[PDB]
Design a protein. Structure first.
Lengths: 152, 151
């Protein structure tokens, strides 16, 4: 499975987009000497370990930056495939609750309710890749359906 | 002073604003205050406003006022269109970010915010005019684009 995980990370346009964003938001250059697989591994967290993360802080800013990078990765693929310039906001309260928003023109291309944000993560690389791909596809379908709104 | 007190009573925007301020006052900390007095924090003369320091983290109290302002705008849009948009105010420690109001898949208002520590308006009329203008632009947009607004 170890050969297959490396192939998924390096082949998937979604995972590649996500790796690009993580590296772009790296103040100290901490990821510079490590593989893509290592860079994205914090997104994959066993269900059981995930369920056990405390909701008591405000969200850790690193976890918050993971969720921003996930949505920016989705936004960058929408922009690549449609030409629509997209912006991203992740708004969370102290409870881990809020919204991930991606918009281009006056069109909402992702408008996702976030809950228990401290526990953000996915069982496997496959589930990460499939969920980010699906959201990007659906955003793309929206831009194709509503150019009259995308151009505003 | 008389036209001000009256405007607070009469203005659909100012009435919406007051309602929001008091909805976020879970412990009735403002129950003995007049409507006009609960609006006063939004009205800060420019000389004074330009001396609020930008050097530290924007005050959580100021963030809540910006949220209430945008929720007032959304409530006016709901009043005239039936559609109540969701509101987000996303700000930096540095006071930069976005005020977003959307309904269905329509971005009804989207304002980039800078130096938000200094949020506020020279006079009551200026607060009322701006809130009203943004709500009226939002109502027009909702009625122009129901194919996305009403999803």
């Amino acid at each position: 499975n170890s050969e297959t995980n490396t192939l998924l990370v390096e082949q998937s346009p979604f995972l590649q987009s996500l790796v690009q964003q993580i590296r772009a938001y790296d103040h100290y250059g901490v990821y510079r000497t490590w593989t893509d697989e290592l860079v994205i591994a914090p997104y994959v967290i066993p269900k059981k370990k995930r369920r056990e993360i405390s909701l008591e802080g405000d969200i850790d800013p690193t976890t918050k930056l993971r969720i921003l990078c996930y949505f920016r990765a989705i936004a960058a693929l929408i922009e690549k495939e449609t030409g629509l310039l997209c912006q991203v906001v992740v708004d969370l309260n102290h409870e881990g609750f809020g919204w991930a928003l991606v918009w281009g023109g006056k069109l909402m291309v992702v408008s996702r309710s976030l809950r228990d944000a401290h526990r953000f993560g996915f069982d496997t690389l496959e589930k990460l890749n499939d969920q980010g791909t699906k959201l990007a596809n659906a955003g793309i379908e929206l831009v194709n359906k509503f150019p009259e709104v995308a151009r505003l």
